[PDB]
């Protein structure tokens, strides 16, 4: 289609990819806290949460 294409659509995407990778990287580091993701737990070894 061309209802969404234009110089104004990815205009506000270029303003929101900083609000996007922050959409994604927070949820990506949110996915280790929940289910005790143990192959990325000691990605940085300062979190010795498992006793």
């Amino acid at each position: 289609l061309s209802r969404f294409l234009g110089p104004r659509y990815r205009e506000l995407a270029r303003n929101w990819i900083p609000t996007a990778s922050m959409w994604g990287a927070v949820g990506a580091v949110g996915l280790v806290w929940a289910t005790d993701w143990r192959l990325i737990l000691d990605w940085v070894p300062y979190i010795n949460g498992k006793f």
């Binding site: 806290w33 929940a34 005790d36 949460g49």
Partner: protein
């Protein structure tokens, strides 16, 4: 409100055992004499211990390298030639046969034409890969910590 209210609720039902010292802690005895595979009810499915004879080695090393499509041999996984540890599920679906039946000395799967060998080999289709070997460390002389 997060680090101890979701992060600690797994063990009641998770990795942590409830019987603690139980079966991969045990002092495995000769709980089956030489040449059979009898069921035991621990680690879920029967780990099949077997007393290994003097000429079952050359059943396993006379077979060369080409058409067995998964290279995982018996000099590498289990540390002693006269010892072995097995798990009772196939790679694709999950069957193991009735004991001591087969053509050249393995376990013949009557689903649609398979036959697993003794120490975790497959000659047949449509099985993709070899047998699960269980975790182990032969630490002792004769009290078996398999896991």
């Amino acid at each position: 409100a997060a680090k101890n209210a979701v992060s600690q609720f797994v063990s009641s039902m998770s990795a942590s055992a409830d019987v603690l010292a139980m079966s991969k802690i045990e002092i495995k005895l000769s709980d089956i004499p030489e040449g059979k595979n009898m069921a035991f009810k621990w680690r879920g499915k029967p780990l099949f211990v077997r007393h290994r004879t003097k000429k079952e080695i050359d059943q396993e090393a006379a077979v060369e390298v080409s058409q067995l499509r998964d290279p995982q041999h018996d000099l590498e996984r289990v540390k002693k030639p006269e010892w072995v540890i097995l798990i009772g599920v196939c790679t694709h679906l999950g069957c193991v046969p009735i004991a001591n039946a087969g053509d050249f000395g393995g376990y013949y799967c009557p689903c649609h034409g398979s036959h697993y060998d003794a120490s975790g080999r497959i000659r047949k289709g449509p099985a993709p890969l070899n047998l699960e070997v269980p975790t182990y460390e032969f630490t002792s002389d004769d009290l078996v910590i398999v896991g």
